Amino acid sequence: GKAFDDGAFTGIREINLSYNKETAIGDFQVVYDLNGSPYVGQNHKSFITGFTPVKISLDFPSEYIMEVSGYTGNVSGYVVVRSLTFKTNKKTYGPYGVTSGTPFNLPIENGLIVGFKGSIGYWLDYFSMYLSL
Amino acid sequence: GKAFDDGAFTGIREINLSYNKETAIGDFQVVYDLNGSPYVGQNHKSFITGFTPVKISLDFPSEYIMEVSGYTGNVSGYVVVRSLTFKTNKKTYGPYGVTSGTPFNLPIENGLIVGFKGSIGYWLDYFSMYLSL
């Protein structure tokens, strides 16, 4: 897959992703907050197409992500993130994509996701998160 | 369980925990660094005995934890931390306990675990970790 790294920003305003329930999470793009103004992140796109796009539009600044969880599993020989769920103080968005395989979750007791990095080939291979106060 | 919250420190020097190879994690205790001095954190003790103690003595400050992982699951009907594994830049300590149930993992690409909080009754019920640069 093609590695990406957004670096760190002030907060998150919108998450844009795509998935296919038969396979895994496909594209990923975040609209960040940068010093109280929207910053449109790079769109990190799969090698292939056919996915279902979703827009998660957060009521920033009062709504923020409290937990990112998911499943990883093998799709056509590739171990990829097959499912994502984003839980905010206001609501849960997801699961998007097939909820079978090995679960992961990052719950946050204090602090803010402020950036994403990872890798996307045919599917989202993996991702990490920047956290700040 | 009985709640505990050590708070945040400069680093970790040593983890003293106990486990049963048939059940879950019991006692948990941490010697932190506090600005260059060992800080003996309070021994957080299971309400029950029968555990096998483990002393994870890190080569602070050159050695530091890069991933904490484990399993949560039912024991006697309670969800508890059944297993913990501490991987550092030098070597892997664990798994300790029973490697069964829902897996979890917090890998750290950048930054440091500087504190623990949680709750222990018969077993370690749950926990969280303070992170810092």
């Binding site: 760190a8 990829v80 998160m129 700040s132 | 750290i108």
Partner: peptide
């Protein structure tokens, strides 16, 4: 040091 600010990073998940 360098002139680049740093930030805690957790992950990755997926493998």
């Amino acid at each position: 040091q360098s002139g680049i600010s740093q930030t805690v990073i957790v992950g990755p998940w997926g493998a």
